Amino acid sequence: MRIKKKNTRGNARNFITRSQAVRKLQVSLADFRRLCIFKGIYPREPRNKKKANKGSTAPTTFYYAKDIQYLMHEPVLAKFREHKTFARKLTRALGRGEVSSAKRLEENRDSYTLDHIIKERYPSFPDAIRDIDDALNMLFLFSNLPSTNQVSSKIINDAQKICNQWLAYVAKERLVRKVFVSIKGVYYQANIKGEEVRWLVPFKFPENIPSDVDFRIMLTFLEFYSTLLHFVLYKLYTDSGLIYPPKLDLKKDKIISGLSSYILESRYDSPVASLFSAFVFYVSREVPIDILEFLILSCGGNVISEAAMDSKVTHQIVDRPVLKNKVAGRTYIQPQWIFDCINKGELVPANKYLPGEALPPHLSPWEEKKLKMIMMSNKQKKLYKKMKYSNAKKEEQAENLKKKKKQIAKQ
Template sequence: MAKIKKKGTSGQAKNYITRTQAVRKLQISLPDFRRLCIFKGIYPREPRNKKKASKTSTPNTTFYYTKDIQYLLHEPLLNKFRDQKALAKKIARSLGRGEVSDASRLEKNHAPKLTLDHVIKERYPTFVDALRDLDDALSLLFLFATLPSTNHVPPKTIALCQRLCHEFQHYLIVTNSLRKSFLSIKGIYYQATIQGQDIMWLVPYRFVQRVNGDVDYRIMATFVDFYTTLLGFVNFRLYSTIGLRYPPKFDTRSDENGAELAAFTLEGRAVGETPKALEASKLQTNGSSKEISREVQDKVDKVIKTAGLNQTKDEQTAETTEESTDAIDRFEPAAPEADTLPQPDMSGNEAGSLFAPFTFYVSREAPKAPLEFILRSFGCKRIGWDAVLGDGAFTHDETDSRITHQIVDRPQLPESSLPAIPAAKDDGAAPKVKPGTRIPGRTYVQPQWIWDCVNEGKLLRADLYAPGATLPPHLSPWVKPTRGGYDPRATLAEQEEEGEAEEAAEGGDSDEEMEDEAPEAQKAVDASDKSEDESVDGGMDVAGTDDDESDSEDEDEDEEKDFNGLEENEATSESEDEDEAARTQHQKELEAEAAGLPFSSSGATDEASKKKSSQSKKLAAKKRKEDEELERQKMMMSRKKRKLLEKMMYSNKKQSDEAAKLRSKRRKLEKGAQE
């Protein structure tokens, strides 16, 4: 007889363990268990069958993999947590005895320090793995860098987050790794490309933050501890790859004066030669192969010349290929109706030369921190701002003749409403300029011009972004227009379907008429429904009666007549419509004659209405034929393919309906602007 297998010793009951059992097995508190799981990257799991996985009948149970908990048993951090617990007992005992000095001494000298270096090495065996997991880290650290200091968020944590974020920004500035940015409601999105990995993070706007008690800052502080260690490792590796010393020099006094990025001083190689240092490794690997290929090419050329062959065409093609390899390849579709292939981003050299020849001045109302970061990332070396915004500017003088572009974010105001110019002081400060004045020879733009130029990879027209002008739509650079979707950059004529504009015009003219006719039509429908209900005995249909059979036969005959004589019915309907149009025209002429008004535009309006009606009928007939053809094709399909086709048609129709709604809104806006 086989051995009886006990319940809960195999299968899902063995593979999963509850949180309570895990805490008991590790012999730590629940907050320490949460911290340990966050550090090690262990998360709850959902079993397929909770009844089989749990030995109890509690429905709301959190499960973990048993192997993950077994892995935590050998974690060195467990000893640190137990030491902290023992120290907390000693401090509580000292405070209970009234020995405050002993308690402070224990907390200061004997507190165990947690180091997460080994955790980072375990979770990220390669540097590329760390770069791939950097999105959430940067978003959370930039968030904590803008929070005010409270009991939950100490100032040391905020200062550490700010320093690490500024160090990461300096690497992006030196290497020109920033590629795209987008202004959204949540904040500013940035995307950088580092060693072939696209990293995207979110930076909140610098508004006054109100820290609420709804957020559990203990869990967020645990993530901050882990992410600060991770970003410190990443910054060290990034700086060492380009030959810069880490950490960079940090001037505390200039940082207190609002210098931010300018408070750091990079040391190592010449900072201007850093992009060349990045290309040095590529040149070293490719240099030997190029020299060998040149020697081989020279030998081949000698052989060809001795043979009397012409090599001019081959030399031209070789030169063109060598020249073309310097630029980034562009992928063109093979056919005009094919899908658009994703194009590669700009290179570091192109990004570093976008704003290089310009000198910018940031006005007081514009956001200085994001503008400085983006401008420096794309090659601008000289940026000035008012002294109120902090230190580190190229110039505080707004009247400096070297300034080529000024970023303004205030509307145009009349001169009478502008305040007076403050009196100049003799302390050597920069002279004040009256707000709203324009210095000749300088281009004034709104901040959106910077972001749109960065996303497009080229300089756009500055007059479209002049102060007080209606700005073009700021679109996300990561959302590409799809076929059949709405594209706000294209005109309505390019996106509208066949006959959509005519239908919209007819619908706009007949909206008021439809609103007037709607109540009367509803009354007629209600009356007809009541009469039909009263005509049937008891309001129910009896199956199998002679009347039903005769009705069905009549309906079949009518359908056959309609199918056979479709063209005749269309011809008769067209003639009836023409007669009705003639009657309405005659009625309008009589009303105009009775009122003593001329009726001269009747012919033109009638012709236009006839053209619109004929076009709408043609479109309706074409659509009807397409629907009939589609139904015939669906009848020849299998059930599985038919269901798949219906799902595709549903999703396409939903997308087209949304695009049509957006086009109608745009059509109304343009019509209102013209009026």
Template sequence: MGKIKKKFSEGSSRTYTTRNRALRKLQVSLADFRRLCILKGIYPVEPRSQKKANRGSSKPTTFYYAKDIQLLLSEPLIAKFREHKIFLRKLQRALGKDDLTRAKGLEARRPEYTLDHLVIERYPAFVDALRDLDDALCMVFLFATMPTVSKVNNEIVEDCKRLSTEFMHYVIHSHSLRKVFLSIKGIYYQAEIQGQSITWIVPYQFSQNVPLDVDFKVMATFLQFYRTLLGFVNYRLYTTSNLSYPPKVDQSMDDSAAGLGSLRIEAKRVEDLIKGVQSSDTTSVPEVTMSKQMKQRMDTLGSKIKKIVAADTTTPAYESVGSGEADGDVDDETRQSGNLLFGKQVFFLSREVPRYSLEFVVRAFGGRLGWDQTSGGGSPYAENDRAITVQISDRPVQGHQFLDRIYVQPQWVYDSINARRLLDVEDYLIGQPLPAHLSPFVEYEEGDYVPEAASKLAAAAGFEGEVTNLKPEDRDQSEDEDEDAEEAADIDGASADEDAPDSDEEDEEDEDAIAEKQHQKQLLAERAGVSFSEYQQKQGAKPKPKAVAGKKRTKAEVEEEERQKIAISMLSKKKRKVVNRTQADAYKKAKDVNTLKTRKAQATAKPVKSAKGKKN
């Protein structure tokens, strides 16, 4: 006789655990458990059988992996949370007794904790942190534009502004911005950093009303971890680019609303690098035991670093906009590359355009710019400067114009970035109706609806693909049979007896589907106010959509059609369903494309002028 196993000792009941059991095991409150799960990156899971995972109970509940809960037992943050609760009780007791001296002493000894170990634990490699940076940037940029209210602390908002500005400065310095899209929700940006595509959204800088139905406690917990993560990422990006971190803030420029120009990004000096290497080596290896060869290498390190810095001409020298020398040392060949699209342009921003976005994208692509004094201080170019080549304005009428520059609307900048070339300015002149602002994140496939503007951009860029041919016409019988042949060619011919064990289930599914269709037809007949037999007769009298007259097919095409039909009939029932489902999806896709074409034709059609009647 085998050993009797204890109930619920293996299987799903041991792999998963409920939230209530996790709270009893960790001896924490529900709020602290949520904070721990958010900070540690532990999320609820859905077991295959909830009844087995819940030890025979069918009551709906939240499940977690038992190993994740076991991992939380050794988390030092639990002790920090308990210390903070004890501190709050002592502080409340002191304030209740009006003991202000004790309350001040407790406030000075407030327990604090950091999340540095969690960042290292969750992201052992720097590439992992870059892959997971999208949500962090969205959250930080959101709180950077939030107003200071009771639910949002002023220190948190200022820290988010600092972190977001530092990241934008690195994107400008590395010229890693790739795509920009203006949507209703905000402005989408995509940058490519160390081979990783990072996409985030920045809200428009409008006055915001803080909603009352948002749980800011949960968002604050996420933001606490994201701020720590972004601080680590910014430090690593700056140090690998030989930039000093944190960047210095020019307080006078910041007070005058200089924006990105208030930060001073400086490269590390060669002397500082040598001192850092020497200090690290002397602390680890005594000077007495240092060999002569090591001393010689240290003596020549300064000259080698100077040679490397002098030879590195691909990375332009970076300074603040306020100095007016942001890209002055960059050669013309580097400016003509894709990352320096505006390398030869000097922009001037009128006061009505979004300066916070245009300054970022223009400088990220190597351009220089100035702005109106009412938009903020620190502008290196005045409006009457002769070096300005392009002025961005969003007013249909200009009070005065300079003949040596081009006046365009802001969309020209964003569309040129997405097209990776300077577009023709005729469609973007002041007062002209703007073309469609297409999303650069959409990739068109064969059969998709391609807007006319996308086809024009692809043709202007010299694309020799099938963009202009991605316009499926009306579906006729020959096209249906061609698609059937393509689908059937990719599927191995198998007999219908291969899936015999599943035939009963498939028959039940077919019967259910037929019954559902019959019920729908009866409802339609009842809605039309006729009997079901009359409704069927009317439906049968209607011409089928596939009976569209087309060109006469050749004998070879007819034989190929028959051969493909025979090949499909030899497939198993399950594989025939796959082929039919694929054909139905293709038909629905073509139908949607044709619907969009019809709507476009109706929208662009000129209205017919009706004849005016004579008055009696």
């Protein structure tokens, strides 16, 4: 054959530049990014930066040619184009003064659905359960986010309803096996089909919203996460035989509209699920019911809230410096004891966590030689030096695990 060019094959065709891919797709960067997020496409590091390009040392992001080529045939592009055409037509109608025509046009529109995207991105339910970690982590945070100009209140309400559905299913299924509390929030873990899915529930305080973060990307991710969560919830309810979607409890919604509402029905096999069995609890006002109520409900206990009006209870939770009544029939407990019980999975004695006492720390449940190294090769010598430098940090951590722990105790 004729003289082939210096670099026009191999990495030069397997990867396509971001700008080149966008130009070939004839799609705006916003729409391309949305499609990428929906498909989960990501940039890849070429084996040789200067070989993928034509000797260019300038920075670049290399995508997979096959992935982009396959993405070009997805219906989502057609739906996006239809949405753009509908938007232009609605703008024309609004500018023409025919509000009724605009209302009729808008009322007859239908949005796209990502159901087929899920069946190809996560062909099997275990994969969806594995990847639901990020979806839960985002939805739980968005549930407590107050409504703003960047996100309509309907989206926040839908996210909160999805989170409530998930929490109710978990409590009824009692699949929770490990819990933890952190500054960033309260971590919850459930053995959903043995996948030990973990999610972080942030504190219910008013979530500060820094305007720097671009909500457009966040909303795009949240849409896919909400669809995935809805499908997973439907699948789980069908597998368990419970009705779906469960009906909200209007009577309970008036009081606190907490986890108690949204009752579910059909149509104790583990130490975690058997703890607190048949127990009745009373939560003081100052303790977060939203956090403790879920744990007790999953454990199979009963909780009486102070707001029940806004005894027979064998356990009481209060964080006040001084308890007022101290009825002998109620066992006063700090939430740290409840957390420790779930972490260990056994009924640790309650006498160690009386109110007002010290709070114990809470931990998560999860030349002889130099002589022979003179002749080592450059690669081996560098590897050994880097390994020693890395192990220096491990040794420092091991030393510090006891140094301060012993020094502070003496004072």
